[PDB]
């Protein structure tokens, strides 16, 4: 570790250190201030005996003449270990639960590696989230990236915590770990997850990376990378099935935009950096399975859509990298729908690989199609009249409408603390159907044994 007291200049969040040697790009630094205060930093640029670094905690209060800079000789790394399970961490990977520090097995670059295309393996099998609206018709598969699109008003934090508890692989002898990443959330929101995780005992199988809204923007960007580096360690080195949940990705993009402005870079679209897509892709591609290895990495990125716009560069690019999305609407939520998932606009591209007779009741593929069709037509009749007098609908158009209604209140409205097994989910969806006539159908001819 090198230490210089030759800090030449300070402009904004950036410092210039001269008469330096052996310094590398993206190297971590420490600023030891005259007051004895310490701040982390990163080498943005090195040029012929000079180093431009950016300070995470800012540059306010720094005295150039009486300050020193330590070059750590490495970038941002995570001290990955098995002891991380049941522990709570910084966005920088530092203990946040006042427990004993972890003696790391090794240190890994939080940027991770790029998987060889021929080394990558297609994803299965099914993952039970205990939430029916998700297991069909928007099924989650091991190694998939299935994001949730929400809004500021909506309760994604509740949905996020419910999945972390109810997530599991039935049945499997392999371990199922959960890596939870909180990005730029308030103390009370973070305290919520912490309180829920320990109340239910879900923390015993989880690794939490907690980044707060008043933490440095840099630590905000590093948070999801700290999590994924841990997830891949447990998955591909420990053979665990890891589920990574991240919120809020909207805050992540803002930190990218915030940091990009500090570095005085021209914005591509909506003020966001042109490499926002490339920066989301760097994150979202760090999921899946490896041939020959037991473990897997599944991602559930949760983000709030600014102004409820899906064409926004944040959810737009995410949609371009994630295979499907779970949509939450205010119309449902305002109607007391929990979770308020609109299964219509929602999608799961890899669902067909998770809904397997070996993995899920064969009723599922058909039942899902039937349930969708029935709800869809049900909602529509209501949607127009509505304008026309609803009254008693022409023929069974009223019947469409009415079972759509029951559909929201008992199928989707399971409750944020009710864990439905995939078998129970299938029966209920059918229970709507049994109430429908055998006459109207998209369903299987062998309505048996059930």
């Amino acid at each position: 570790i090198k230490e210089y007291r030759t800090i030449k200049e300070v402009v904004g969040p950036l410092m210039a250190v001269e008469k330096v040697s052996g310094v590398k790009y993206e190297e971590l630094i420490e600023v030891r201030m005259q007051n004895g205060e310490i701040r982390r930093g990163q080498v943005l640029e090195v040029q012929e005996d000079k180093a431009m670094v950016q300070i995470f905690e800012g540059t306010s209060g720094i005295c150039l003449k009486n300050s020193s800079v330590r070059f750590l000789g490495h970038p941002l790394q995570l001290g990955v270990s098995e002891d991380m399970i049941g522990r709570v961490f910084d966005g920088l990977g530092r203990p946040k639960d006042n427990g004993p520090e972890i003696l790391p097995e090794k240190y890994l670059d939080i940027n991770g590696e790029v998987i060889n295309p021929i080394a990558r393996d297609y994803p299965d099998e099914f993952i039970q989230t205990g939430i029916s609206a998700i297991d069909h018709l928007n099924t989650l598969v091991r190694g998939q990236k299935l994001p949730v699109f929400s809004g500021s008003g909506l309760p994604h934090k509740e949905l996020a915590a419910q999945i972390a508890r109810q997530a599991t692989v039935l049945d499997s002898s392999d371990d199922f770990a959960v890596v939870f990443a909180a990005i730029g959330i308030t103390f009370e929101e973070a305290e919520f997850f912490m309180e829920d995780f320990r109340q239910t005992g879900a923390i015993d199988r989880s690794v939490m990376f907690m980044n707060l809204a008043n933490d440095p923007a840099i630590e905000r960007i590093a948070t999801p990378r700290m999590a994924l580096t841990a997830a891949e360690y447990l998955a591909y080195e420990k053979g665990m099935h890891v589920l990574v949940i991240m919120t809020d990705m909207t805050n992540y993009a803002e930190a990218l935009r915030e940091i990009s402005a500090a570095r005085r870079e021209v914005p591509g679209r909506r003020g966001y950096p042109g490499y926002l897509y490339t920066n989301l892709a760097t994150l979202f591609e760090r999921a899946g399975r490896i041939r020959g290895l037991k473990g897997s990495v599944t991602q559930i990125p949760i983000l709030t859509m600014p102004e409820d716009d899906k064409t926004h560069p944040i959810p737009d690019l995410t949609g371009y990298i994630t295979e499907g999305q779970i949509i939450l609407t205010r119309e449902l939520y305002k109607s007391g729908i929990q979770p308020p998932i609109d299964v219509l606009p929602s999608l799961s591209r890899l669902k067909d690989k998770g809904t397997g007779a070996g993995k899920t009741r064969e009723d599922h593929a058909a039942t899902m199609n039937q349930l969708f069709a029935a709800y869809a037509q049900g909602k529509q009749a209501k949607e127009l009249a509505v304008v026309l007098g609803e009254s008693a609908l022409s023929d069974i158009d009223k019947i469409y409408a009415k079972f759509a209604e029951r559909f929201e209140n008992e199928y989707v409205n399971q409750g944020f603390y009710t864990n439905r097994t995939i078998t129970e989910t299938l029966d209920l969806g059918w229970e709507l159907l049994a109430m429908l006539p055998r006459t109207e159908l998209k369903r299987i001819k062998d309505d048996l044994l059930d």
Binding site: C63, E188, N214, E254
Partner: protein
């Protein structure tokens, strides 16, 4: 002292050489006039300085002096009852020293009175080990508030010498034995406003703040350490609500912050606030509050540092173990100052001109409020509850400032000009307003009242939203088309709206409603609907119920004006309700 020399003057930007020992964000005195400035960049030894005041008539060659510290506030006896600007300059003292009605440039004034003699009462004994936050003594600063003198952060050791007596805030009142030798302590301590004062631990704000305003305490309550936002459109009576919260609330001290407001509007605050009376003491409210005042005409840095100066002072009394309420009005005008400072720094334009770190700055502000365990061996608690005014042009809550605020606060009191035009006060929209403390506050209320209060609240709100849907049916069309059960729900909603939600701040008794009184009032309104509903199922009819309950409904209407001393006159209304409805059932 190391003195620099101006080498360039271009608008608000001043560059000075021979500033090698300067620090970033340090305050400076620029030129002969010694106008207030801040170090923005270091070269060194050339420092870039953003000047807060007019730089007209300043040129190269003139001197520059670093104060050696960042923008800080003086914390000690003499701060309470005072009115400051964004950087804590005493406005009244400014008028005395300058003999002027204007804020001249290059005028330097301490925030507090350094000549004033205070009596320091030592409560800690010599030989005691102390650290940051420990109370060594107190001062009876005002008729209301007792100023507690704490050990400054960075100090740790044993008390060698301590004694009571008459001192100034500059006199050493205590001597502490440290690793680094003896260190004198005074009654005042300085602190940088951009840095949150340290604490032992942050706690969840679950204890409800009694504002005495029925609509808030009941349906959209805020806890001690919680944060709330207010739209404050014109004519909605936002000022009267702020006054009600300020002088009725559970908190010990109030910190009002006016961030670059209109001259005449800021004048209202400066004059009307001292006229506010403290309910408990009968004294002026100012015996309990510190006030910041800024006009749009004033230096953008002062307008931008206004809320940070205020929150710092709030944190200071919080460390003492007090509950503080800090009102910021208007945070939308604060953001305007921030936006402008972004341009003067030539930063990349964020959303709509606001800096890319707008959301961050707001988060940093509100996260400095809340319930905490203060520093000190006694581990006392304190809290900062934030009430912020948002004022988007065109009344669009969709904009960046309001949007990011709602992203970090858990309470929203939607003031409506529509309700105001309908003579509904306070004009808080019960449909669009919300409080994410409702569940937690509800559990607290049930435990302290020994009642099913949370059920009563959800029932009342269920009726309110029940009304909004029935209202849509009345038009398109016909009030009469509705059933006797629906017609009853509307009247119960009328009750809740007029008998409960509407509150006259200027009435002697209706100005404040106790926690126990709110229970009885809502318990007589709901029990009227319960009996009426039970009556309807017993062959009773809506009209026969209404026309035969004009008298008892009269009492319910006057229930708000019933003295706290005779709450029994409210609970007895339930008897008259069960007795009158039973009479209708024949």
């Amino acid at each position: 002292m190391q003195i620099g020399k101006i080498i360039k003057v271009s608008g608000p930007l001043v560059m000075a050489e021979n500033m090698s020992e300067a620090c970033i964000q340090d305050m400076c005195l620029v030129g002969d006039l010694g106008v207030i400035g801040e170090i923005i960049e270091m070269r060194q030894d050339v420092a870039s300085i953003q000047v807060y005041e007019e730089t007209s008539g300043i040129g190269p060659g003139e001197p520059v002096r670093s104060t050696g510290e960042a923008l800080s506030v003086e914390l000690g006896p003499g701060i309470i009852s005072q009115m400051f600007d964004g950087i804590q300059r005493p406005l009244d003292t400014f008028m005395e020293v300058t003999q002027s009605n204007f804020l001249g440039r290059g005028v330097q004034l301490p925030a507090l009175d350094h000549e004033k003699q205070w009596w320091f009462e030592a409560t800690i004994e010599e030989g005691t080990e102390v650290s940051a936050g420990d109370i060594i003594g107190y001062v009876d600063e005002t008729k209301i508030i007792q100023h507690k003198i704490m050990v400054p952060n960075g100090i740790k050791g044993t008390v060698q010498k301590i004694e009571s007596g008459s001192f100034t805030i500059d006199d050493p009142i205590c001597v502490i034995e440290t690793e680094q030798g003896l260190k004198e302590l005074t009654m005042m301590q300085k602190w940088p406003v951009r840095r949150g004062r340290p604490i032992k631990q942050k706690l969840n704000p679950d204890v409800p703040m009694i504002t005495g305003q029925r609509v808030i305490d009941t349906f959209f309550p805020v806890t001690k350490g919680g944060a709330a936002a207010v739209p404050g459109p014109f004519g909605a009576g936002k000022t009267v609500v702020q006054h009600q919260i300020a002088k009725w609330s559970d908190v010990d001290l109030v910190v009002y912050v006016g961030c670059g407001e209109r001259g005449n509007e800021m004048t209202d605050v400066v004059n009307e606030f001292p006229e506010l009376i403290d309910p408990n003491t009968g004294e002026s409210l100012m015996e309990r509050t510190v006030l910041i005042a800024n006009t749009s005409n004033m230096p953008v840095a002062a307008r931008e540092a206004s809320i940070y100066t205020g929150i710092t002072i709030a944190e200071y009394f919080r460390d003492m173990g007090y509950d503080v309420a800090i009102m910021a009005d208007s945070t939308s005008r604060w953001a305007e100052a921030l936006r402008e400072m972004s341009g003067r720094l030539e930063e990349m334009p964020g959303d709509e001109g606001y800096p890319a770190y707008l959301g961050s700055r707001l988060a940093e502000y509100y996260e400095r409020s809340g319930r905490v365990i203060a520093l000190g061996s006694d581990q006392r608690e304190g809290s900062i509850t934030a009430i912020s005014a948002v004022s988007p042009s065109g009344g669009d809550i969709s904009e960046p400032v309001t949007q990011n605020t709602l992203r970090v606060v858990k309470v929203f009191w939607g003031l409506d000009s529509s309700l105001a035009q309908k003579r509904h006060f306070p004009s808080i929209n019960w449909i669009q307003s919300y409080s994410l403390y409702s569940t937690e506050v509800g559990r607290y209320m049930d435990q302290i009242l020994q009642q099913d209060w949370s059920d009563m609240v959800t029932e009342g709100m269920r009726i309110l939203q029940e009304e909004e849907q029935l209202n849509e049916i009345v038009r398109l069309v016909g009030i009469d088309s509705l059933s006797d059960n629906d017609r009853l729900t509307l009247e119960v909603a009328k009750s809740i709206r007029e008998d409960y939600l509407q509150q006259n701040a200027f009435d002697d008794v209706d100005t404040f409603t106790s926690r126990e009184k709110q229970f009885n009032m809502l318990k007589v309104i709901l029990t009227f609907g319960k009996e009426a509903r039970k009556a309807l199922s017993l062959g009773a009819y809506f009209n026969e119920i209404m026309e035969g309950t004009v008298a008892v409904r009269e009492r319910i209407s006057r229930s708000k004006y019933i003295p706290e001393e005779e709450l029994a006159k409210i609970s007895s209304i339930n008897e008259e309700i069960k007795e009158t409805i039973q009479l209708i059932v024949s």
